[PDB]
Amino acid sequence: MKRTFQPSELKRKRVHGFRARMATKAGRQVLARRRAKGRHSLTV
Amino acid sequence: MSKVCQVTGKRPVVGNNVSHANNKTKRRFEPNLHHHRFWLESEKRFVRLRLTTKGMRIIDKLGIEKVVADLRAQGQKI
Amino acid sequence: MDVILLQRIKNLGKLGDKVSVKAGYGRNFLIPQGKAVAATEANTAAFEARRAELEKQEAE
RNA sequence: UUCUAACUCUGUCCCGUGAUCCGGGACGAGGACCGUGUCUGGUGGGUAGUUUGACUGGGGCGGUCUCCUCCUAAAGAGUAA
RNA sequence: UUUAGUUGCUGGGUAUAGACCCGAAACCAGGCGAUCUAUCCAUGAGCAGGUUGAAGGUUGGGUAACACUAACUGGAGGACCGAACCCACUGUCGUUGAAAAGCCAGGGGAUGACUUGUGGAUAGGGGUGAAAGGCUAAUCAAGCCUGGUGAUAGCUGGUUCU
RNA sequence: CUCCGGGGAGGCGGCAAAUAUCCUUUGAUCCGGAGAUGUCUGAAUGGGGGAACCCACCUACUUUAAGGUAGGUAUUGCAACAUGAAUACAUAGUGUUGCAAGGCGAACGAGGGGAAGUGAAACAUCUCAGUACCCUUAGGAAAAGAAAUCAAUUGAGAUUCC
Numbered sequence: 238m239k240r241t242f243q244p245s246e247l248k249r250k251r252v253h254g255f256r257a258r259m260a261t262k263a264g265r266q267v268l269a270r271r272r273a274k275g276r277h278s279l280t281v
Numbered sequence: 282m283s284k285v286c287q288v289t290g291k292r293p294v295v296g297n298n299v300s301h302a303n304n305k306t307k308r309r310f311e312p313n314l315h316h317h318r319f320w321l322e323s324e325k326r327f328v329r330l331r332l333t334t335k336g337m338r339i340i341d342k343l344g345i346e347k348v349v350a351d352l353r354a355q356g357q358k359i
Numbered sequence: 360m361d362v363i364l365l366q367r368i369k370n371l372g373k374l375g376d377k378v379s380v381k382a383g384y385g386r387n388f389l390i391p392q393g394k395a396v397a398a399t400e401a402n403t404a405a406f407e408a409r410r411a412e413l414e415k416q417e418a419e
Numbered sequence: 420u421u422c423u424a425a426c427u428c429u430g431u432c433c434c435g436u437g438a439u440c441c442g443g444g445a446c447g448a449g450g451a452c453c454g455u456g457u458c459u460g461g462u463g464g465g466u467a468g469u470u471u472g473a474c475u476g477g478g479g480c481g482g483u484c485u486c487c488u489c490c491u492a493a494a495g496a497g498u499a500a
Numbered sequence: 501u502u503u504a505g506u507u508g509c510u511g512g513g514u515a516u517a518g519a520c521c522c523g524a525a526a527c528c529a530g531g532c533g534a535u536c537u538a539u540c541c542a543u544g545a546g547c548a549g550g551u552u553g554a555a556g557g558u559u560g561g562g563u564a565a566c567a568c569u570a571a572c573u574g575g576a577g578g579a580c581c582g583a584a585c586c587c588a589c590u591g592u593c594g595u596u597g598a599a600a601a602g603c604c605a606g607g608g609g610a611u612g613a614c615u616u617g618u619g620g621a622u623a624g625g626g627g628u629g630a631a632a633g634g635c636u637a638a639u640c641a642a643g644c645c646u647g648g649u650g651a652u653a654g655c656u657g658g659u660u661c662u
Numbered sequence: 663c664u665c666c667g668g669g670g671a672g673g674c675g676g677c678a679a680a681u682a683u684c685c686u687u688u689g690a691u692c693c694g695g696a697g698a699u700g701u702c703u704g705a706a707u708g709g710g711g712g713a714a715c716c717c718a719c720c721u722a723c724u725u726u727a728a729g730g731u732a733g734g735u736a737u738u739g740c741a742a743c744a745u746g747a748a749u750a751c752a753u754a755g756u757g758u759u760g761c762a763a764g765g766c767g768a769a770c771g772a773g774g775g776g777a778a779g780u781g782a783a784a785c786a787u788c789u790c791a792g793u794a795c796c797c798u799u800a801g802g803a804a805a806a807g808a809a810a811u812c813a814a815u816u817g818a819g820a821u822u823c824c
């Protein structure tokens with residue numbers, strides 16, 4: 238049966254990517270929180 | 282880019298509705314804002330201002346030229 | 360407003376009389392078109408001290 | 420009843436301008452109306468916060484909830500359903 | 501008219517604080533989700549084979565002329581049978597499964613209100629719904645995450661040497 | 663990598679031993695100060711974009727082939743200069759040059775908005791509480807501050823904190 242995750246790299250980058258995060262203030266807050274926590278990878 | 286009087290700086294303020302049972306809910310009071318064209322003789326043109334009726338009274342009392350000069354001094358494009 | 364007329368008006372007066380009108384009348388018709396000037400002390404002094412002779416001079 | 424000058428136009432023309440936005444100008448049709456601010460009466464499950472008792476031979480339905488008199492009450496007082 | 505208080509230190513009790521510890525269903529604020537699914541938008545793709553014979557057209561009989569009538573053409577349909585494809589009506593099996601929804605044997609639609617790829621739009625008292633309170637990432641009579649927050653619990657449990 | 667100063671026999675960073683080539687009393691390794699270099703992404707600023715990629719233009723020098731070197735090319739605000747509609751004067755608009763700003767980051771400050779769980783043994787006034795949270799913006803602190811203030815024998819004498 239079809240499962241929920243159907244991968245597509247273009248859609249992944251356009252929804253959760255670096256420029257998508259930078260495009261809004263809430264995404265920039267997400268990036269700030271992840272930098273403060275010290276994540277090794279900021280985005281997908 | 283807002284509900285701000287150009288002459289007085291008036292803007293909406295918050296308050297309460299108070300019912301007969303004393304329930305309180307937030308509201309705003311808005312200024313009596315509108316657009317108005319004023320003849321400027323020194324510049325031979327109409328200037329369109331967003332202002333309140335109190336600002337209109339101030340213009341009545343002080344003359345349009347003085348008010349326009351004051352706004353330009355505060356840094357407005359009139 | 361209190362205004363000083365710069366010309367003849369049918370029911371108001373003529374040629375320098377000070378008369379109280381409704382604010383809209385002064386603001387939107389008389390003052391912008393030059394038929395009157397707001398009766399400030401400076402305006403009254405400037406009108407009466409000098410210019411009044413030519414204002415009277417213009418008959419029509 | 421009439422008017423224009425505040426104000427309206429998701430009507431025409433001109434310019435910014437390579438532009439069905441916007442701004443300025445000229446017209447036309449309206450016009451002290453419409454519309455907006457403050458105050459105010461009405462309507463208002465559209466939406467929101469809540470309330471909707473207890474006893475009880477389970478609960479509900481019925482009955483009862485305070486006071487006075489007699490019996491139960493066992494010859495002082497008090498004594499439950 | 502009662503005629504020993506007061507300031508420290510230690511201990512018992514009370515009050516305000518989470519106040520002995522663990523436990524809700526909830527309520528509020530800000531963010532994250534339409535790679536599943538619902539509807540829509542743009543641009544592409546798919547439907548073996550076989551039937552039936554609508555409208556229309558031509559010719560021929562027949563009338564005073566119409567009427568009427570036969571044959572041949574023509575190829576319509578939310579048309580018919582039936583693979584791919586899309587569904588899910590019945591039964592056995594499976595139920596610590598091969599599988600967190602299946603297999604097998606039958607079953608329905610199959611040129612249409614059809615199926616489908618890629619890329620987009622709609623975001624939580626909101627969306628979408630040929631309408632079942634259905635669906636909104638194995639979660640839905642109000643999604644998920646983080647905060648208020650150690651919510652409150654007249655309730656249940658537990659509470660350690662002589 | 664360079665210079666200045668220190669130091670005086672070892673050294674070629676660690677996991678991580680061995681190995682080779684080696685360096686060093688003509689002063690190494692090492693320590694301190696000052697310089698040189700400093701790819702690409704990122705406010706990212708020549709345009710674009712799915713971050714670390716794609717595509718450019720203009721000057722000056724250089725090369726003969728299909729290139730190299732250096733510089734410039736974002737937006738907004740202010741100033742100067744130039745240019746310049748409807749429309750005559752103007753104004754709007756346009757361009758060049760110069761200067762400035764944007765982004766990040768603990769807590770504390772100032773300002774703009776602002777809950778509910780909870781308590782009241784129910785609950786609506788009230789409480790929680792101007793708390794949590796969202797937004798804007800400084801400084802080493804910020805804010806406030808020199809009485810149209812208090813007091814009530816006519817006295818005190820600006821703010822801030824205990």
Ligand SMILES: NCCC[C@H](N)CC(=O)NCCC[C@H](N)CC(=O)NCCC[C@H](N)CC(=O)N[C@@H]1[C@H](O)[C@@H](OC(N)=O)[C@@H](CO)O[C@H]1NC1=N[C@@H]2C(=O)NC[C@@H](O)[C@H]2N1
Pocket residue numbers: 297298299300301302303308787
């Ligand atoms: N955007 C806002 C839109 C406004 C809108 N136009 C409505 C409007 O215009 N005014 C609203 C009133 C604003 C006011 N601040 C509310 C207030 O102060 N309440 C007081 C409540 C007291 C107490 N907590 C409860 C109470 O005893 N209540 C009673 C009574 O229960 C109520 O009856 C209802 N309730 O059922 C009503 C009779 O009808 O009388 C109330 N008592 C009183 N009523 C009078 C009053 O208001 N003033 C004067 C004096 O007379 C007052 N005493």
